[PDB]
Assembly symmetry: D2
Homo-oligomer: 224 residues x 4
């Protein structure tokens, strides 16, 4: 089974929030989220191995933000090498999970001196043939220069992983951190749409588990 760490935003009932998931769809932590239909939102995710705290903030205009944090040592949860990505799922609604931009930075600072390793990428435009992205499910790129995670026109699942593996952590590092930001547009001609969007970190060869729809986000195989 794939090892997943995710920060998701979803409006699926199953009894509007953002949550931090560690290997399970049963969020270790959540916070309400005033999902604004048709408005561009921004999410920032940060982590560093000194605080060992995974935090996220999602925001829309008019000071409408939401945050959530969780103390966890990712070095004990994730393998040393991972891939990172975005995932989305919809219900039986006419909705979009468009990503307008996505950036990520990962750094490893060694116990040595001036010995730092890093990876950084930023997409503000997505090409029809975006070769440094691995597309899964209904995810396509290029439409209006954006990354459409789910099929636009019921129930769709899509993911986009950055092509290269990320060395998210290492034993000989004094500090390890990463940051990710993405802007998304969830547009729906429907008032209360069932939707889910997430940023995730997984084992390198991760793929969409059989049956990972709705609240599973294309990340988890059932609500275990």
């Amino acid at each position: 089974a794939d090892t997943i760490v995710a920060v998701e935003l979803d409006t699926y009932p199953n009894t509007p929030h953002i949550g931090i998931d560690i290997k399970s769809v049963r969020s270790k932590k959540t916070a309400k989220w005033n999902m604004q239909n048709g408005k561009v939102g921004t999410a920032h995710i940060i982590y560093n191995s000194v605080d060992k705290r995974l935090s996220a903030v999602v925001s829309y205009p008019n000071a409408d933000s939401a945050t959530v944090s969780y103390d966890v040592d990712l070095d004990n949860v994730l393998p040393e090498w991972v891939r990172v990505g975005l995932s989305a799922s919809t219900g039986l609604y006419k909705e979009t999970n468009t990503i307008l931009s996505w950036s990520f930075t990962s750094k490893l600072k060694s116990n040595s001196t001036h010995e730092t390793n890093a990876l950084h990428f930023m997409f503000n435009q997505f090409s029809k043939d975006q070769k440094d992205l691995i597309l899964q499910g209904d995810a396509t790129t290029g439409t209006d220069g954006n990354l459409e995670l789910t099929r636009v026109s019921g129930s769709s699942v899509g993911r986009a992983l950055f092509y290269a593996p990320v060395h998210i952590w290492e034993s000989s590092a004094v500090v390890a951190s990463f940051e990710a930001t993405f802007t998304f547009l969830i547009k729906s001609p429907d008032s209360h749409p069932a939707d889910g969007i997430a940023f995730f970190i997984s084992n390198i060869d991760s793929s969409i588990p059989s049956g990972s729809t709705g609240r599973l986000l294309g990340l988890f195989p059932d609500a275990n």
Copy 2:
């Protein structure tokens, strides 16, 4: 007096330690620090308005590293605009506080799309006439391209970056900063008393009168 927030490393007697000062020389938090004479040390200081946690890690090559954190919302401690610098102060022993490198990055990110403001600077080589640095006290630049914070007696010196840093703002969704500096503390003495720190303060900050020794040149 000056509004100061510092991350300091001093061996002023009990045991060598690293601490976080929030408007006081009485560290709000400390951790043991096994200071090594003649060895290059590295310090990383991180902060972000989400966790509102200030943390620092000090390490030596092929040795254990000391870390220390502290929950503090700098938005309630510091003025919106500040300057950042490094300060040192020797007790009375023959010791040096050479800075080999120093980087800083500050970012303010507003709700609006792609509305990020950043300031970043990196020094790996210091020149005799370093105009973007405000040197105070016995602080000098140029010797081997290094930044000597103290006189190479009871010396005290600081170096602040010339430009004011918009460290926080009310319209920001996230404000963060990171700072890294490498230092080398030499001393032919056994138990040298020394202090070195990274600090953030009001713009017009200067060395308080008689702020030597344990006062790190930051506190009156």
Copy 3:
């Protein structure tokens, strides 16, 4: 007299272009420029000491760009320490010289190893009290979060320099480079407005020379 290196865009007759000025208002090089009124433009300026070539590209939507380059060793033209800024001037027209964003990066790579010095700043929003900027002339900040170089409501001159001095070059550097980008909006209810906008590099204590209006751009004292 101040030592100025500038890349300017101006529509002043004096017989629409972009030009590279080295210590003189008599451009060492120019290129036509299809000034689009009411459209946001972007300018990119680059230089590196290996090519010793100063180049700029200005662009508006619909593939409407313009470029200009000039071979020059800035180390022989500028002092070792400088300040950098933006300047603007208008004629007897109702026009604006609004800067929406401005970024700059300067790097010095020493003959040593892993010994690099850098300075980078980016403004995507300008505060009412922007302390790390030195405002001169009619330049004000904060209006709609922008930097208005000339007074908005005849003939106005304004400049904005970044507060800290830049170590644009040094004898012991193997490579020195800088890059600057800014987006500007020149809006005018008038068809053919007289205007000028520029990015410039000057001696540290540079100020607006007496009489530097119109084509002088607030940078040069007369057309010498």
Copy 4:
């Protein structure tokens, strides 16, 4: 064959030199290079679609630096997508081609406001299992955290970054890239024959059959 653009340094006899190869081992431009044995060298490679000039500078600490440029619009030479790597090849002498550090930055900037795409990576320490690197030939990682391009005989090895780099695009206003790497070439021999290079090529590029010695492992 593979579409290659390289900046190479080789001592394969006439005199040591650095050159720029554009689809051929017959350098489109060269400059003398006073190679130093046992000394760490640094190479910086820069390019931007405005000047359409590819330039490189190689230098040693406390020594002269060799530079070489060449007007070339890579948009007419390279496919839109490529991979970037380092390659080396020893002649027959006992010599090493250790890479100590390697950085790369590529940016595409469209007309639209703030529509920049960038890729940046930096290696200062190489691990035994470097998954984001495609090692070819005698190339290995881990030894002292360095990247050994050649076997430590007539050895040849390359290392490419795992992810494809969108090096250029028709909708870009400016496309630029920079690359810096530090190398150390040891050899107990007097006139060692060696070759080392930074290259950009088609995605599925691999070491051409018998591309040893002067072929730098890049040319058939």
